[PDB]
Amino acid sequence: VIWGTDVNVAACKENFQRFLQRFIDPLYMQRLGEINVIGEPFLNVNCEHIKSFDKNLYRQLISYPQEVIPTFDMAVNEIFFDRYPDSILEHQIQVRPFNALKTKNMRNLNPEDIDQLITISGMVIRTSQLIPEMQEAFFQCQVCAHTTRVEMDRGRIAEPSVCGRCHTTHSMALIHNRSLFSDKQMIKLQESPEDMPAGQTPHTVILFAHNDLVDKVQPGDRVNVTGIYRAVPIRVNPRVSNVKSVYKTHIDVIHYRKTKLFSEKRVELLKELSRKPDIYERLASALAPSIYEHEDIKKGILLQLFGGTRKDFSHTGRGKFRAEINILLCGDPGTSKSQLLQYVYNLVPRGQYTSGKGSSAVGLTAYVMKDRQLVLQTGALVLSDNGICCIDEFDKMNESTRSVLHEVMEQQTLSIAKAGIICQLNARTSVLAAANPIESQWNPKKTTIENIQLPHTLLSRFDLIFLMLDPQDEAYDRRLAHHLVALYYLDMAVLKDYIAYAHSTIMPRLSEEASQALIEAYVDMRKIGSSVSAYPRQLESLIRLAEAHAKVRLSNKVEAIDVEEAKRLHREALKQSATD
């Protein structure tokens, strides 16, 4: 074996080559044929397959990824030289193993894993242009033009300091274009936030895609990356060869995985309780128990959590559809709007919480900034690209930000002219806006637009406008206070699994009953408006609401009961927002 390792070149190769041929879910030979057809000279492999096939080889793989991978390529290429023995490829096949040891506690990573393969789930934050790094430096004497080369001089380059032909003084200067280079992309990636128990300080790491696998992950993408953990010294000064005792560390990526659920008991449990007739009401009452007497608001946000069914109108030429639900909560201060947003953001996965003020700690916009490389720092909406962004104090905002909000609500994407190029960052998020009245309290006989002074267009894009206030009813204050004092002296997890399962599995779809019920509801609204009339965006809200209610029922097909509840809840917001 090579020194310091339990690795034999031939035996490991045969064991790996045995794994390629002999396997049970043989797929590796099939994708090899696909590779022989396509020509893509890589073989991405779930390492757990090697674990199931050979735990020792998997253990041997983790211990010595750098040492063992060239043997794996050698085994695969000979297999390619066996099956389809003649072929044409710009270079022979390679292997990019992945999904081996989910040490996803990135914040808990030890130096024991140095030079051992690890896979981690996280969201890429920043990237950069590919760095052309020298591997062979062409040189040529200044005096007599005597050419030469220096090849892979241990990272640094060794200045010849003397010619070869005339052997003059230091005259052999590097030739940039004649030299040999390789691509190297630097990426900075953050720990996956939901995986962090405390999250008091989210962990961040660096990545290096060398000569290949470059630009395959755009910023903000939540992916599982598998690569070799690395640590290198840092010179105290570039001039001096002294180095620090501490060691800055990075990952050399080997594979990118772009991105069942739980045990069978959970799917049994959610399917069980879903059969309850009042599960829709029970979840609403169960959701946000700290709040009291608000149920229409609770039901609305619950439908937003479930969200409308994913729809793909690309075939129709109609573009993407806002399947997500955007609810604006408008009400007096002290009415628990902020608590609800904090509650929903705390419960919801991959969510976001921000403030309508520009002084929000995050900021609801992406922009370029010098690292000193001018790199795009993302925005909260893009950060919650699919999740839910709970925006507090939404009323107070910059008009340009409101313009940005109008775009993403209209298009589910954010267009930014970085430098000169324009990038359309897709943001199919769900917006939970919280707005407070202008002045101390809500003056009646003034619309929400009068009482908030916002564009009628933008709030029209909001499907649901929940108007909540503080009535001058001492009974409600009395019951509320008793409820709070009782609080002074269903678990969320099952609810989160329910929504996660519904998104993972269920997909609402229109029934002709629901279709006709929706049509009757809209024309009825139009007839009511025939005497603020109906708008087809309201129909878009109603169908989207019906999908969420069907998703709550886990029917997988929208039913007229969804339409009736959607019509009811839509009318509630109309009644709440109705004003003369």
Binding site: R318, A419, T457, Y535
Partner: protein, 591 residues
């Protein structure tokens, strides 16, 4: 005192290619190109890559592999070829511009492996820097020994001499520059990006900086789409490096007969059927707009906008518009954004945007300091990106005053001349514009004039060929039908559309139809004259009056409807329908 025999061999064979290779006629074409190159302002010699491959396939492949290495030798061989041939000025720079390379790569395909070797690429310009003289052969002299360190070529940075020309002296730090003797050449930095076609959906394009020299300096402009032959090269920057593509030649990004021959038989048959197909007008509108109910006049006008009339340049050099400008004013919702989105979705060269767009470009060309270099750069806006295309602008009511006047200048001229901070330039933009707006106070007051209904200035109103008013009718039948269309679309997730003609077939027909230039029959001329007599006799009351601008739109519309059927001449059928569209477009004040 070292010679690269490969470069000597390549230079000789390339010089042989210059002085032996010949056209099909049997004459040395490159002698004729060199003969034309003797003129002032003429230094780049065009060369066909396939020709020198035929002359020597090894020479072409070696040049392809080591293009940067051998390129100075090509210029030197060009100098020997051209100097003796004619009375060329003794020393003016000469360059070789390549072409006929099939290996057209995407920007995604560029790598360190492709450094130095020649390659062709295609993309869209983003921003163009001013021209700047750049030293190529530095002429230096050590202050102490005063020996002239001659012709120290600088690798695109302030590379002083390493050591004195005098072996005795080693001052090593006080090389003064000779301003005149150092060779110079003008370089221009330009940013390009991936074209939309190559670009994956939702993917950020690979921005690329390129250097332009000799005739290539002004070859391309800001915001245009072009193809470039040359090679990629590293450049050191503050052992760091960054990539730039030096393009020797710049070409634009891609006739009816040539298209029809290049068009496959099935595509030819379909397009031939489509040209023969009567009622293609309504059938195309229905196919183009599956998720739409009613408002077919909007669908009609957009389709005419997609085709557009024939442009004309007068004997006085005054350009006359070929495309057109159309606007829509509609109540809240009512599918205007949906209209624009379908148009953008179907059409390449169709760019969507909003008047609320707070970009510094302001939808058009803009002059802005570089974020790093601090020099002003002509950064192209989306309107310039849509050159010879379409712009689906939203929130046209909510435009900015700066954009408003600049846009008004653009549509009036079909071009924009931008001048600020000393920098000056002009750019062509023959782009159909689809304005989307809402009435003032949200809803359209038909009892009030269009000037009251919208905030747009009268020149904007004049320069727009058409205006379509959409109003929320209380008629339940339309409301029921729209809901039926929408719910069927949602319930029938796919297959709800009814595309009698596929969008590719639609696009192929438009491309082939665009190759035609329909003419005005004298029958149609008097027919057009007769139509405007009725319009003039009608005299509105119309929300807007009737100037010659209405007639100009009419003839451009008739040309488009002549282009609809691919007929080389206009007929009265096209004119009367064009009159029907515009005359119906005239909405009278309903007070």
């Amino acid at each position: 005192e070292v010679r690269d025999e490969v470069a000597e061999k390549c230079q000789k064979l390339f010089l042989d290619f210059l002085e032996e290779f010949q056209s099909s006629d049997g004459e040395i074409k490159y002698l004729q190109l060199a003969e034309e190159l003797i003129r002032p302002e003429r230094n780049t010699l065009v060369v066909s890559f396939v020709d020198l491959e035929q002359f020597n396939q090894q020479l072409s492949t070696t040049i392809q592999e080591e293009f940067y290495r051998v390129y100075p030798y090509l210029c030197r061989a060009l100098k020997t070829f051209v100097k003796d041939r004619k009375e060329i000025p003794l020393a003016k720079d000469f360059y070789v511009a390549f072409q006929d390379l099939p290996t057209r790569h995407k920007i995604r395909e560029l790598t360190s492996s492709r450094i130095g070797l020649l390659t062709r690429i295609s993309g869209q310009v983003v921003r163009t820097h001013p021209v700047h003289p750049e030293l190529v052969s530095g002429t230096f002299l050590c202050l102490d020994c005063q020996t002239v360190i001659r012709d120290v070529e600088q690798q695109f940075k302030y590379t002083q001499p390493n050591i004195c020309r005098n072996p005795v002296c080693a001052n090593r730090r006080r090389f003064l520059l000779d301003t005149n003797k150092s060779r110079f050449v003008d370089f221009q930095k330009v940013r390009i990006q991936e074209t939309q076609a190559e670009l994956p959906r939702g993917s950020i394009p690979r921005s690329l900086e390129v250097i332009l020299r000799a005739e290539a300096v002004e070859s391309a402009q800001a915001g245009d789409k072009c193809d470039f032959t040359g090679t990629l090269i590293v450049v050191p920057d503050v052992l760091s490096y960054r990539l730039v593509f030096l393009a020797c030649c710049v070409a634009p990004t891609n006739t009816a007969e040539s298209i029809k021959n290049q068009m496959t038989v099935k595509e030819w048959e379909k397009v031939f059927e489509m040209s023969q197909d009567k009622n293609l007008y309504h059938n195309l509108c229905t196919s183009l707009f599956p998720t739409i109910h009613g408002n077919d006049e909007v669908k009609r006008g957009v389709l005419l906008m997609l085709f557009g009339g024939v442009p004309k340049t007068t004997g006085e050099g005054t350009s006359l518009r070929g495309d057109i400008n159309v606007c829509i004013v509609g109540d809240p919702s009512t599918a205007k954004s949906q209209f624009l989105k379908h148009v953008e979705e179907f059409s390449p060269r169709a760019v969507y945007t909003s008047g609320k767009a707070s970009s510094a470009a302001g939808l058009t060309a803009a002059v802005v300091r570089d974020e790093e270099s601090h020099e002003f750069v002509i950064e192209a806006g989306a309107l310039m990106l849509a050159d010879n295309g379409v712009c689906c602008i939203d929130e046209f009511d909510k435009m900015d005053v700066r954009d408003q006047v600049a846009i008004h200048e653009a549509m009036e001229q079909q071009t924009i001349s931008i001048t600020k901070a000393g920098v000056k330039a002009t750019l062509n933009a023959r782009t159909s514009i689809l304005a989307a707006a809402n009435p003032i106070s949200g809803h359209y007051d038909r009892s009030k004039s269009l000037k009251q209904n919208i905030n747009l200035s009268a020149p904007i109103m004049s320069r727009f060929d058409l205006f379509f008013i959409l109003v929320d009718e209380c008629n339940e039948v339309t409301d029921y039908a729209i809901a039926r269309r929408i719910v069927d679309l949602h319930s029938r997730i796919e297959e709800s559309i009814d595309r009698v003609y596929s969008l590719d077939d639609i696009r192929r027909y438009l491309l082939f139809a665009r190759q035609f230039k329909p003419k005005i029959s004298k029958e149609s001329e008097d027919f057009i004259v007769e139509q405007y007599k009725h319009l003039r006799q009608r005299d509105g009351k119309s929300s807007w009056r009737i100037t010659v601008r209405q007639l100009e739109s009419m003839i451009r519309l008739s040309e488009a409807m002549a282009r609809m059927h691919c007929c080389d001449e206009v007929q009265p059928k096209h004119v009367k329908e064009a009159f029907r569209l515009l005359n119906k477009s005239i909405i009278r004040v309903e007070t």
